[PDB]
Design a protein around this ligand. Structure first.
Ligand SMILES: Cc1cc2c3c(c1C)C(C)(C)C[C@@H](C(=O)Cc1ccccc1)N3c1c([nH]c(=O)[nH]c1=O)N2C[C@H](O)[C@H](O)[C@H](O)COP(=O)(O)O
Ligand SMILES: Cc1cc2c3c(c1C)C(C)(C)C[C@@H](C(=O)Cc1ccccc1)N3c1c([nH]c(=O)[nH]c1=O)N2C[C@H](O)[C@H](O)[C@H](O)COP(=O)(O)O
Ligand SMILES: [K+]
Ligand SMILES: [K+]
Ligand SMILES: [K+]
Ligand SMILES: [K+]
Ligand SMILES: [Mn+2]
Ligand SMILES: [Mn+2]
Lengths: 497, 497
């Protein structure tokens, strides 16, 4: 066999073939050691670790793959892990990756295909046979409030009426032998669907959590595609293939046939339990900061022979919470802007901003034809984005003109720092949903859930009127073409590197 | 040999010895080519170029050294050029460099020593014998409004009463055979002294411009040491040695004995001429943006045999306008804060901010004892800094706690992005002097000369009260010491780089 983008086991193979995998066959402790190695990998853009000999692995549960969506060292294949989720060449640009993830947005869905069995059915454990506290679930950060089994699996929940099945990543930790607790927060789709079941009031939410799903599916799971859109059919259109799914044993949900590990059960409409703290995407943990979270009951586990659990050891740069959350949100924001008739060509969440900013590249020819001003345009952009779920995680939008490559953080920083006058060239948004996970929100001086957002206009005045009126004081723009070429051609002759 | 910090010719030797120099002995055009090579050096942190065969060099005037204060590639000796200005080991940290530049602030001055002659007297040209338009003055950027002879020399002017002699860098370009035009703007000391002569009204300002001065002198020339303080005596205290100076031939000013090239003349109290545009430190040139500047008359040139003119090809990162202007301003700001009883331990202007920000590291134990709040503390800090000349070039101050290394831009960006809530955690300053060279000031939407400043508080709430209440979600802080060491010790064994 199955292609890498359609089968996690094949994806692991692909990373090996790529010389992008280190297989660790000696015993590794899931209590911190696996996550520490993965953390170091993510901080240094090293090869992904596959822990084949995890202390506590029994009867096939489980090996761990760390850093599944993290960066490679080389510039040429920096995003190659992400490309391997999507059948793209390993040298694919971020633009190419994001365009692939947006491609299904004006295609008919390709609904999934139901097949009678698959590798995820190779082994099973009923509710007399498993204990979640006895599995080699990792402690990811030393101060975490639980062992976070769920950092890179896919929650599956369906609206009561059956018309929308959502796939998404949301964290969860082990509560006891047969329960998890996790985040289920607005405006996320798992929360939206949970609210539908709670208003109906009759039962707990049928649920499954599938780990080691098709890589193309985990990417859509991490993207804020629209309300009401079933991720499986979006992935089918993106990949050009209907995804093969098998029915759960204990409920009527459907999971990818090649899932490594599947939990089946219910998400309670009534019960909560302690959740967190967790070392999070912005780079912090607040020890002792436990709060009630949603509570999941597990009734059944099914799994592949020699099952592999993917794990995100998230925190400071760079891991899946940056490469996927930020970039995929930025992609959806780009599309949302264009659908609102805003002249945005590109969007990216700079890593340097801890993926709390999105830089929006403006087609300034189109802007000029709008015959508008900074104040008006900033407000329009911020209203569109900050009032929408796709903008949830993003607290600063930086508008830049056509000369800036938004996928290059040094260039975004240059433009922000030199073209946006603090205060005057910004519009603050206090009456929008805020992202409480940012430390200055949930642990800050103001409301955790509201405000703290800004549109920073790094468009220069003449970009709204007559056109750019500067040249950069750089090698590229400050010297004629023939001179530049001469200098390059004589560079090593003269004595330079 | 004479020591490198005391003699520019010896400094050039030192860069060669260091394998930090490329001697270009074939013909190089001062019309763009020399500056293009230097620009490329600065953008890539390559070796400094010494142009020994400059097209248009005659009778000893002149060779060019580019990139005298720019960065080296290696992290270990990144600031080695700057260290070579100061007699410091080439591996000196930025903290060490800035401490050396601040050291003379609580020492008695060591006034200069007058000697009868020096190398700067080896050759001379009277006012019948030179023509500035006939010298190989560089065109530094293709759209510059003149040939900028003066990018790394030292202007010397003295108060009418004789009590203060200032040394400073300010740009100047050739106007005609015997005149320059340049920037002389408030609140700079050359401007302050010029205003004293203008109020006296009796004559033009006696002036000299010395190129290829002692490196320790050019560093102080680039630093905003206090009003009324004679740089020569500050440099003498910093270096532990009295600087040797020779009298000008045509006026009673005194220049370093080993200056490569000296212009003697007057800075007019009445005349102006076209100046600019110039490709500037923030990374831009605005073609055609010429304005009246100060006008200098040159009466005499003296120079060393085989004179070398230093040149800054300034613009986008990284050159002297970043490494020296930003860092030296930040050093003075650190001291100014401490003298105002503010608990600041360190300051640096991040390169990523185009040296428009300064990050201020706070001793949070001291902060806690102040029993203050963010609003109050931000306002106090901003009032101190933004009302002072040392703050002139800086538009954003970022307050950070003790965990942040302000000399590491990635860590400043992380703290700013995650700990400062836009709007609420900031105080805007509109009634302070602004720096018009920033594009969003002089080419922006508001007053060029006023406002546009902000204090951004990236201190978290408990840093004012009870202490830091988080751990970073990073390898260093999220795992115990013994585990970290194990992972490091087994890193290459396991298969990692
Ligand atoms: C790639 C990744 C993604 C998330 C998360 C992590 C990783 C690796 C982990 C599990 C490592 C961290 C965790 C987070 O702590 C970060 C976070 C992000 C956004 C909201 C809350 C938490 N998390 C997560 C997340 N969404 C969350 O609702 N709680 C979560 O727990 N997300 C983001 C989420 O998938 C996206 O917002 C999707 O758009 C959601 O799908 P839809 O609702 O649009 O269908
Ligand atoms: C290292 C360097 C420094 C400057 C400049 C350049 C370089 C390489 C060049 C010449 C390349 C660029 C030019 C600039 O265009 C940048 C600039 C900076 C600050 C004000 C105006 C211009 N410039 C300069 C500068 N000061 C200026 O008053 N006009 C100047 O022309 N400075 C800064 C100035 O030296 C410092 O502010 C000192 O504190 C001044 O001394 P005191 O007044 O405190 O005694
Ligand atoms: K999703
Ligand atoms: K602007
Ligand atoms: K000075
Ligand atoms: K703050
Ligand atoms: Mn969804
Ligand atoms: Mn001075």
């Amino acid at each position: 066999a199955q292609p890498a983008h359609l089968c996690f086991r094949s994806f692991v193979e692909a990373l090996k073939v790529d010389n992008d995998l280190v297989e660790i066959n000696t015993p590794i402790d899931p209590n911190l050691e696996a996550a520490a190695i993965t953390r170091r990998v993510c901080e240094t853009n090293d090869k992904a670790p596959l822990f084949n000999n995890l202390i506590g692995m029994k009867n096939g549960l489980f090996r761990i793959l760390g850093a599944p969506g993290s960066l490679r060292k080389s510039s040429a294949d920096r995003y190659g892990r992400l490309a391997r989720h999507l059948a793209l060449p390993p040298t694919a640009s971020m633009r190419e990756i994001l365009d692939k993830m947006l491609s299904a947005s004006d295609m008919p869905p390709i609904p999934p295909t139901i097949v009678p069995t698959g590798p995820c059915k190779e082994n099973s454990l009923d509710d007399s046979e498993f204990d979640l506290t006895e599995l080699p679930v990792p402690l990811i950060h030393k101060s975490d409030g639980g062992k976070y089994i769920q950092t890179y699996g896919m929650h599956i929940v369906q609206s009561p009426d059956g018309t929308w099945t959502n796939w998404s990543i949301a964290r969860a930790m082990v509560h006891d032998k047969n329960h998890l607790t996790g985040l289920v927060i607005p405006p996320q789709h798992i929360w939206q669907i949970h609210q539908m079941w709670k208003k109906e009031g009759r039962s707990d939410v049928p649920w499954a959590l599938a780990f080691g799903v098709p890589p193309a599916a985990i990417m859509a799971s991490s993207m804020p595609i629209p309300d009401g859109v079933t991720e499986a059919g979006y992935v089918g259109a993106m990949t050009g293939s209907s995804l093969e799914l098998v029915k759960c044993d204990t409920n009527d949900l459907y999971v990818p046939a090649t899932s490594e590990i599947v939990l089946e059960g219910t998400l309670s409409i009534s019960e909560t339990g302690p959740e967190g703290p967790f070392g999070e995407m912005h780079g912090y943990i607040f020890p002792g900061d436990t709060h009630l979270g949603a509570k999941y009951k597990v009734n059944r586990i099914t799994y592949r022979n020699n099952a592999i659990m993917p794990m995100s050891s998230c925190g400071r740069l760079t891991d899946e919470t940056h490469t996927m959350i930020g970039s995929l949100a930025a992609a959806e924001i780009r599309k949302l802007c264009q659908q609102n008739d805003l002249p945005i060509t590109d969007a990216f969440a700079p890593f340097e901003s801890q993926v709390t900013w999105v830089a929006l590249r403006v087609d300034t020819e189109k802007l000029r034809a709008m015959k508008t001003t900074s104040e008006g345009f900033r407000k329009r952009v911020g209203d569109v984005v900050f009032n929408h779920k796709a903008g949830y995680t993003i607290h600063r939008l930086v508008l830049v003109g056509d000369d800036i490559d938004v996928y290059e953080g040094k260039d975004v920083l240059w433009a922000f720092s030199t073209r946006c006058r603090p205060g005057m060239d910004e519009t603050l948004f206090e009456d929008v949903r805020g992202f409480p996970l940012i430390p200055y929100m949930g642990h800050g001086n103001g409301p955790a859930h509201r405000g703290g957002k800004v549109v920073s206009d790094a468009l220069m005045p003449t970009e709204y009127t007559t056109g750019r009126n500067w040249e950069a004081a750089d090698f590229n723009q400050s010297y004629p073409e023939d001179l530049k070429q001469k200098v390059l051609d004589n560079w090593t002759k003269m004595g330079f590197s």
